[PDB]
Amino acid sequence: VPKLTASVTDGAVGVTVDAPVSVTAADGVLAAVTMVNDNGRPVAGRLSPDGLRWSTTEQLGYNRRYTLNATALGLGGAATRQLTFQTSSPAHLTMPYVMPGDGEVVGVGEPVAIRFDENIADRGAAEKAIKITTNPPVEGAFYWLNNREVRWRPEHFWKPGTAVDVAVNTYGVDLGEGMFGEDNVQTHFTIGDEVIATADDNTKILTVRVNGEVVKSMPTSMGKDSTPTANGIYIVGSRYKHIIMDSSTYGVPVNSPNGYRTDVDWATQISYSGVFVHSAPWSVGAQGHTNTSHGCLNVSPSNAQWFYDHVKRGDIVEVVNTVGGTLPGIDGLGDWNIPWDQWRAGNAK
Numbered sequence: 001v002p003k004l005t006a007s008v009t010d011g012a013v014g015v016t017v018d019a020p021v022s023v024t025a026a027d028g029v030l031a032a033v034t035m036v037n038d039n040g041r042p043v044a045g046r047l048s049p050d051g052l053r054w055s056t057t058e059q060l061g062y063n064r065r066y067t068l069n070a071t072a073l074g075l076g077g078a079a080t081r082q083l084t085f086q087t088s089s090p091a092h093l094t095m096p097y098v099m100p101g102d103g104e105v106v107g108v109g110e111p112v113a114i115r116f117d118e119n120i121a122d123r124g125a126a127e128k129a130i131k132i133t134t135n136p137p138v139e140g141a142f143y144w145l146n147n148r149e150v151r152w153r154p155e156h157f158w159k160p161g162t163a164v165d166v167a168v169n170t171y172g173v174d175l176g177e178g179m180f181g182e183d184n185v186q187t188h189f190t191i192g193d194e195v196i197a198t199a200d201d202n203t204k205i206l207t208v209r210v211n212g213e214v215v216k217s218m219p220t221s222m223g224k225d226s227t228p229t230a231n232g233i234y235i236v237g238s239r240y241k242h243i244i245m246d247s248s249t250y251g252v253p254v255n256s257p258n259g260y261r262t263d264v265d266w267a268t269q270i271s272y273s274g275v276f277v278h279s280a281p282w283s284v285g286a287q288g289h290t291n292t293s294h295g296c297l298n299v300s301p302s303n304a305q306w307f308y309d310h311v312k313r314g315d316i317v318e319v320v321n322t323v324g325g326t327l328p329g330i331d332g333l334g335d336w337n338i339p340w341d342q343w344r345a346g347n348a349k
């Protein structure tokens with residue numbers, strides 16, 4: 001008689017739904033295989049052309065009891081078998097979100113970012129549920145920025161032309177304290193040209209290199225000694241054609257000495273802390289000579305629009321020789337300031 005094997009055991013509980021359920025027959029073929037819930041609704045499944053193996057084709061649900069019926073037929077006759085199991089019952093669910101967006105072309109400094117809408121109690125599980133593929137292949141590693149967002153990057157800036165595939169396979173995974181993934185998330189992106197801009201406080205020149213060659217110099221005026229621009233490696237973020245900056249947000253009333261409601265053009269964000277490269281017509285005389293800002297890299301209106309036009313998310317701004325300290329590794333765009341050994345060793349525990 002034929003032999004039936006399944007990837008689940010009869011009477012099992014807490015069966016995780018991160019995996020398909022499969023049925024195999026030896027010494028015969030599968031005539032039929034059905035799987036239903038406790039309202040007798042069938043789960044989508046597929047039987048191989050050779051009749052040897054069947055598998056479910058759609059996500060199983062949480063809190064469900066499934067009944068599997070299978071019948072195989074061979075030379076020695078027929079065999080019919082049945083089992084029931086129950087799936088995980090989460091305490092909570094969390095949903096993941098991943099940047100950069102799918103399809104995007106990004107700069108050589110862009111990390112893979114996966115953000116959850118709940119605190120992750122088992123970072124180790126989360127990391128293992130995330131599969132990142134790279135071509136040309138390159139070693140990278142996970143580091144957590146806070147309790148909800150993990151980052152991934154190589155030791156050195158990405159090589160242009162690298163395809164990155166990210167499969168966040170969290171559905172059915174116990175992420176700790178009864179917390180399970182709400183769904184999977186998939187994304188794909190590509191690394192473009194190496195663009196690295198360097199602001200040297202010694203010279204007050206912001207020089208932009210594309211694949212190693214200067215294509216632009218910009219006189220700049222960085223943060224004054226009271227509020228200096230931090231040295232470090234910054235990752236380019238969002239850009240805006242026009243933006244305001246209110247001191248009303250952060251407590252300071254606009255009708256106060258240090259208050260400021262300021263219309264700003266051509267702003268390219270390079271740190272979560274609020275450092276921008278932007279249009280500063282009112283500082284043009286100081287640019288290339290004196291620092292005058294609150295930290296932002298002030299450039300001329302046409303130098304700011306050039307930057308907004310030719311610089312992309314993930315490109316790099318390196319700041320050097322100023323009187324500030326270093327940008328925090330965990331700023332949000334400060335990832336490269338954490339030494340590799342510390343980054344690679346991670347903080348999953």
Ligand SMILES: *C(=O)[C@@H]([C@@H]1N=C(C(=O)O)[C@@H](S[C@@H]2CN[C@H](C(=O)N(C)C)C2)[C@@H]1C)[C@@H](C)O
Pocket residue numbers: 245250273274275276293294295296
């Ligand atoms: C660029 O100069 C823009 C930003 N304005 C700033 C400001 O005047 O405060 C700074 S950020 C500043 C640093 N910490 C403060 C804060 O919110 N915390 C205490 C955490 C705000 C920034 C470069 C433009 C608005 O001036």
